[PDB]
Amino acid sequence: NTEINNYEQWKCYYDNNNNKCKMKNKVTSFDEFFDFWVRKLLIDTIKWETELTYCICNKCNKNCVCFDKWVKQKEDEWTNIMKLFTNKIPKKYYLNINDLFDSFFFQVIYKFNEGEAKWNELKENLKKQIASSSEAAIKVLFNHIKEIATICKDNNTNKVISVKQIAQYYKRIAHKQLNERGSRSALKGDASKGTRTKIGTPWTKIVEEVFLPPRRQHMCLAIHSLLGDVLLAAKEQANFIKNKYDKGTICRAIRYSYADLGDIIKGTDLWEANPGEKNTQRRLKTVFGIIKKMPYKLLREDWWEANRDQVWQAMKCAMKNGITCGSSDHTPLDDYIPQKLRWLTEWAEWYCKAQSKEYEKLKEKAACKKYGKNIKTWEDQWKVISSKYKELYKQAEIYADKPVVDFLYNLYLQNGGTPSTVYSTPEGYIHQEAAMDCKQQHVFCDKQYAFRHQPHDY
C-alpha cells in the first residue's frame, strides 16, 4: 500500500503471493519491481559518474546540478520502498555489496563498453567507503553518489576573468591534488561520531603590513572530534553575525567568516599576531598530527577540502536570509581566494560604508573638518593597501605572498597576459570585485574621488 515515485509512477503492495506492484498498466510482482529499480539505479549510477568524469565552461554546472537532483530523487524513492517493510528485511532485498554486484553483474555490464571495468571500479569504490565506515549495498551506494554529487557541485559553484573564476581554478586544483593523494575517504568526518562594531572605525594596522577587519576580530576520533568542533564554531559564527551584528552585509559577513575559518584551519591566515589565535593554531597542529598518525598545512589543506561542505552547511542554520547567490550547493569559492584579496575587497566595502556614514552628517564648512578628515584617516589605509597590491601585481607580471603572486599572474594571464585589462591597478581591482555604497565619492582612481576632502556636490 505504498507509491514509489513525463516518468513512471507505481503503487506497491507487500505481504508478511499477491504482493504485486502496479505501474498501459504494467503489473509485476514486488520482487520484479525491486529488481527493476535496483538494476536501473546501478546502470544510471555508472553512466552518471562516467559522464561527469571530466568535471568531477558553465556547461557541466548545469549537468552536475542535475546529477545532484537525481541523487536526491533516488534516495526518496528508496525510502518509499522501505516503507513497505517497516522493520529494520530479508537478504532477498538486503543484498551485501559483494552480493548485489555478483547478482547484478550481467544485467549491468551488459549496458556498457568495457562494462566489466565500470562494474569493478564501482565495486571497489563502494567497498572502500564501507571499509572506511556487512551493510546493504544500496545504502552504501547512496552514500557514494551523494559524495560525488557534492564533490562535483564544488567544481562548478555556479573580456574579464574574475577573481571568482580564478578561485575556481584553485579549487579544481585543490581537489585534483586531493584526489591523487586519495585521502578524502579517510579525512571527511561524520558529525554524529563527534561530541569594531562601528562602521566609521579604520582597520587595525598590523605589521608584527595588513589591515585587520573588525569582522575577523569578532570571531567565535580526532577527525570526527575536529569536525564537530569546527562545525560548532561555524554555526556559532553564523548565529553571531545573524543575531548580534544589510542583506548584502549579512551575506558577505557570513561568507567571509566562512573563508576566514577555512584559513584558520588550513593555517594560511594572516592574523597570527594574536595569542588567542596562536593558542588555536597550536591546538590544530596537535589534532592534525593525531590525525596523521591515517604545521600539517598540506594535510590540513586536504582535511578542510575533505570537510568544507559540512562546514558551510553549518553556517546556513536558523535563517530565512538566502545567501545562495552565485554558488552551487550554495557553497562559495571564497576559501580559494587569497586572504589578502578578500580583506582588500572587504576594506573597500567598509570604507564606502564609512564615507556614507560621515557624508550623511553634512545635511541641515566647519563640518567638513571632520568629513574629509575622517576620510583622510581611511585614505591613508588605502595608500598602504594600494602600494602592496602593486608590488605583488608587478611580481606576477614578471612571473607571468606566494599565493597572491601566483593568483594574480594566473588571473593576469587570463586577462591579457600582453597588457593587463582591469587588474593591474588596485583601484581598478576594487572597481571589478567590490561593491561600493559610498555617495558622490565613487572613484578610487586619482572630481568624484573616493578620498576627496569635500564631495564635488557639497
Binding site: 510482482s29 520482487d31 520484479e32 529488481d35 530479508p90 537478504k91 532477498k92 559483494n98 552480493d99 555478483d102 547478482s103 547484478f104 553483474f105 550481467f106 544485467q107 555490464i109 551488459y110 562494462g115 566489466e116
Partner: protein, 165 residues
C-alpha cells in the same frame, strides 16, 4: 580421478529459484547443495577440505549461483523465457596427461550449451539456434569472467581438488 558436478535449478519465477545439486569425486558423492536463492545451503559431506578453504569455496559457489541467476534473469528479460524452467548444469574435470574439462548446460533436459577451453569459448550444443541460445553465448564469449575465469575454475581449481582428494 575426476569431478562430476551437477546442479538443477528450478525456476518457478525468473526471481524465484529452487536449487538442488551435488558433486561426486570419482564415483562417490562428496558434496550436496539445496535450497532457494535466498537460503541455499552448500554442504561438504566428506569434510576433507580445510574449513577456511571450504568457506572460500562456498563463497565462490554462492557468487556463482547469484551470477547464474543474474544471467537467467537477463536472458529472460532480453529474450522471453518460459517458466517453470529447469536448468541442469553438468560440469567437470578428468585426469596421465593434461586434464580434460567440460561444461554443458541443458534446459528442461535438452542440452542447450557447452564450453570449449581451447579458444575459451562457449558454443551451442543444440542444433537449433534461437534468440535465447545466441544471447546466452554472447555473455559467455564477451566477458573475461565467463571465458577465462571459468577456465581457471575448470582446468585449475577443479583439478587441484581431484588431484588432492
Amino acid at each position: 580421478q575426476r569431478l562430476h558436478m551437477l546442479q538443477i535449478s528450478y525456476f518457478r519465477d525468473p526471481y524465484h529459484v529452487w536449487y538442488q545439486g551435488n558433486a561426486s569425486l570419482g564415483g562417490h558423492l562428496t558434496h550436496v547443495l539445496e535450497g532457494p536463492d535466498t537460503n541455499t545451503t552448500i554442504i561438504q559431506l566428506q569434510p576433507l577440505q580445510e574449513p577456511e578453504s571450504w568457506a572460500r569455496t562456498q563463497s565462490g559457489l554462492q557468487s556463482y549461483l547469484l551470477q547464474f541467476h543474474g544471467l537467467v534473469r537477463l536472458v529472460h528479460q532480453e529474450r522471453t523465457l518460459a517458466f517453470p524452467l529447469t536448468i541442469r548444469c553438468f560440469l567437470g574435470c578428468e585426469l596421465g596427461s593434461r586434464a580434460h574439462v567440460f561444461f554443458e548446460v541443458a534446459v528442461n533436459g535438452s542440452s542447450f550449451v557447452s564450453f570449449r577451453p581451447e579458444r575459451a569459448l562457449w558454443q551451442a550444443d543444440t542444433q537449433v539456434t534461437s534468440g535465447v541460445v545466441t544471447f546466452t553465448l554472447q555473455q559467455l564469449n564477451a566477458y573475461n569472467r565467463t571465458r577465462y575465469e571459468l577456465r581457471e575454475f575448470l582446468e585449475d581449481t577443479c583439478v587441484q581438488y581431484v588431484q588432492k582428494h
